[PDB]
């Protein structure tokens, strides 16, 4: 009634990257207790985008993380009111992305609202040149702090060339009402682009995420 074993979501993003404004609207579905989800996203303003899709793809759903039975699933516990998160990503060539997100449960669906700001990407780097090829699998190190949940990630983007482009990521997740925090644990994440049209104005994504104890 709050969270079924199968749940749909709607997402809206408004963003800019190096000053290029855009909007994206999407719909997805997944199995929140199995840690799996898919979404289809559409660029509704600002398309086609002059930058790599991959810097957007991790901003489109942490209600869909499989947790062990003995770890409180802080973000699921926050619903129906939900939670907010704030993220900063520092890319190795100076690019910066800051993201703020609102998550709620309305009429049996999750509703995601995202605001994104990317700045200082080199005009000759892989993001503005669209030279990226998807994210390697990640491990998000989770820990409680200041009454919030924090996650840190060393994220690695593959390049069409071969080789690497790294980002350091830190996210704060906060429930809209007090919720019991877990201890430290890790979330293993894999995000795939499963389909896209030639210019990435329509993209389909798949993500699997699983929480694991990092001690014991």
């Amino acid at each position: 009634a709050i969270i079924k074993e199968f749940m749909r979501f709607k997402v809206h993003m408004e963003g800019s990257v190096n000053g290029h404004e855009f909007e994206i609207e999407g719909e997805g579905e997944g199995r929140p207790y199995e840690g799996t989800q898919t979404a289809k996203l559409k660029v509704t303003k600002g398309g086609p985008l002059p930058f790599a899709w991959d810097i957007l793809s991790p901003q489109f759903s942490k209600a869909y993380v499989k947790h062990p039975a003995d770890i409180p699933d802080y973000l699921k516990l926050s619903f129906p009111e939900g939670f907010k998160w704030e993220r900063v990503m520092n890319f190795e060539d100076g690019g910066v992305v800051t993201v703020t997100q609102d998550s709620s449960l309305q009429d049996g669906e999750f509703i995601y609202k995202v605001k994104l700001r990317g700045t200082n990407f080199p005009s000759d780097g892989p993001v503005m040149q669209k030279k990226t090829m998807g994210w390697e699998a990640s491990s998000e190190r989770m820990y409680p702090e200041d009454g919030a949940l924090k996650g840190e990630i060393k994220q690695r983007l593959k390049l069409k060339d071969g080789g690497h482009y790294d980002a350091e990521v830190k996210t704060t997740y906060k429930a809209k009402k007090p919720v019991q925090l877990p201890g430290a644990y890790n979330v293993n994440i894999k995000l795939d682009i499963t389909s896209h049209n030639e210019d990435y104005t329509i993209v389909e994504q798949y993500e699997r995420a699983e929480g694991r104890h990092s001690t014991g």
Partner: nanobody
Amino acid sequence: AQVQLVESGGSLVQPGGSLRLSCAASGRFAESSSMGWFRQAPGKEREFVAAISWSGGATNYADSAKGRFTLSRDNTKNTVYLQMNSLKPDDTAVYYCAANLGNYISSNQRLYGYWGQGTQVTVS
């Protein structure tokens, strides 16, 4: 044992009578425990009755329980109360409470990681 569950209230009652079961959750995560009631009659499958979220704010009832059972939560004591009205003989069973830390309140038994020992309801 981060959640311990203790059911009580099992008793003999006459057809058409009513009983109030309770389940007290204790342990570090008792305050985040969503609790579900399941019943198992002798030589039969466990079946969902009703569940209520950790906040006491969302409730979900099997069709058999709608209109006649009421599930509520006292958040002071992390205790849930199942008021069962209009009981029939086929309601005879062991009633178990189960909990989870993921805000799940539906019928899939595998999503409940913590189980009580059960309490016997007999209607006759």
